[PDB]
């Protein structure tokens, strides 16, 4: 499709999701990635923590304020992995990068929207079940991310409200089943047309 592609980052693998997002954003699509703290990386946590600490050591020793900037929020960590997949020193790469929006948690614009999933980047698909993995949220917290408890309480409040919305949706759905039985005599012809054509069989 098109419009804005909203991706739920939970359960995905970092680089495999980044490669797909980088190509979509180069193709002109606007992409939103939410819940970057739920992104997984292959390999045990300690090995992945060592990788980030080696990254932290890289720094211009004459003036580290000029040096490479080590963003600690998981959304900015994901933003930098996509950045390494883009020609970000050209105007085309910059414009594509501006089409990417990354978020920790699910802020107001996007919980009341349906999120998409990329099966080619899901951990349940691409990792063997016996292989160890890390959580970007925990890894970010151990290297200096300040807001993991706060994002956790806001996530919990969101999941409570999403749960009430889903029960109302379920009650509507079961009312619609009862409505179907009630008006079966007066909708039988229209149902017959649908069944013959592959809908409602």
């Amino acid at each position: 499709e098109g419009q804005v592609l909203v991706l739920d980052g939970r359960g995905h693998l970092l680089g495999r999701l980044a490669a797909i997002v980088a190509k979509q954003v180069l193709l002109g699509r606007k992409v939103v990635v939410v819940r970057c703290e739920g992104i997984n990386i292959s390999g045990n946590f300690y090995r992945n923590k060592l990788k980030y600490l080696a990254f932290l050591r890289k720094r211009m020793n004459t003036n580290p304020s000029r040096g490479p900037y080590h963003f600690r929020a998981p959304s900015r960590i994901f933003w930098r992995t996509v950045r390494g997949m883009l020609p970000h020193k050209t105007k085309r790469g910059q414009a594509a990068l501006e089409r990417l929006k990354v978020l920790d948690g699910i802020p107001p614009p996007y919980d009341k929207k349906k999120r998409m999933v990329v099966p080619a980047a899901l951990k349940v698909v691409r990792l063997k079940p016996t292989r160890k993995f890390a959580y970007l949220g925990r890894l970010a917290h151990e290297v200096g991310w300040k807001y993991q408890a706060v994002t956790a309480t806001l996530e919990e409040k969101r999941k409570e409200k999403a749960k009430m919305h889903y029960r109302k949706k379920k009650q509507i759905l079961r009312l619609r089943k009862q409505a179907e039985k009630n008006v079966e005599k007066k909708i039988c012809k229209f149902t017959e047309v649908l069944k013959t054509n592959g809908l409602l069989v």
């Binding site: 920790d104 948690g105 300040k146 807001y147 706060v150 994002t151 806001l154």
Partner: protein, 252 residues
């Protein structure tokens, strides 16, 4: 090659930018951690450095050579007239940090506090808060104030008071009050707001913030000394007498 003899570096990089402070008033960068079980109290105050003198007291540390003996100790006197509460600020916790949610000001604000809102009080018409105050009197405005306190009650995690010093009582040329946010600690957000509301426009003496023989933190701006060489700024070793083109500098 290596340094012949080791010596620790001169100065600290923990105060690295070593520039003029962007603020004249000292800033509280971390308030004491909130404990809801404790009663409602303030956490900071504003004073003025008057001078230094020395006192005589007898110490009570048993194993010391000065135990039960009279000692002379230098002290500093900080003049602290009472502060006037003029506002309340609410904050919400977000995954991007603490964000200012809503601030409410008192009905009558003194002229010395209004002076902080102007760079040229002489040329001003003194119109600051002249429309805001009318909201405290109008019936529609009163309802909005109550709704605004209720939203702060159910959404804010941090509550602060805007308070200013009274410069009428000080022997200073300056007449413009210093404004400050002072965090309210203890209790619940509802109890903090009720405490704040009732002493809005009121006076808080320093004895209700600090007590005797307690250990406090002092925040301020250091005495200015202008442009300085590396010998005074960083306390480097002076070069020998027979040095060409300068002694008070770092050689390499």
């Amino acid at each position: 090659s290596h340094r012949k003899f080791s010596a620790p570096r001169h100065g600290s990089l923990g105060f690295l930018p070593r520039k003029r402070s962007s603020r004249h008033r000292g800033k509280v960068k971390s308030f004491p951690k909130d404990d809801a079980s404790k009663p409602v109290h303030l956490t900071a105050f504003l004073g003025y450095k008057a001078g230094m003198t020395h006192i005589v007291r007898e110490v009570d540390r048993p194993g010391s050579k000065v135990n039960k003996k009279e000692v002379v100790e230098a002290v500093t006197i900080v003049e602290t007239p009472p502060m006037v509460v003029v506002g309340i600020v609410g904050y919400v916790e977000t995954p991007r940090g603490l964000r200012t949610f809503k601030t409410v000001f008192a009905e009558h604000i003194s002229d010395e506090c209004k002076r902080r809102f102007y760079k040229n009080w002489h040329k001003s018409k003194k119109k600051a808060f002249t429309k805001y105050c009318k909201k405290w009197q109008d019936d529609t405005g009163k309802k909005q104030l109550e709704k605004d306190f209720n939203s702060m009650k159910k959404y804010c995690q941090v509550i602060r008071i805007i308070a200013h010093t009274q410069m009428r009582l000080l022997p200073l040329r300056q007449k413009k009050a210093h404004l400050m946010e002072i965090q309210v600690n203890g209790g619940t957000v509802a109890e903090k707001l009720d405490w704040a509301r009732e002493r809005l426009e009121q006076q808080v003496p320093v004895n209700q913030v600090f007590g005797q023989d307690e250990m406090i933190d002092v925040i301020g701006v250091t005495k200015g000394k202008g442009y300085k060489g590396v010998t005074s700024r960083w306390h480097t070793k002076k070069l020998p007498r027979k040095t060409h083109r300068g002694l008070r500098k770092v050689a390499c």
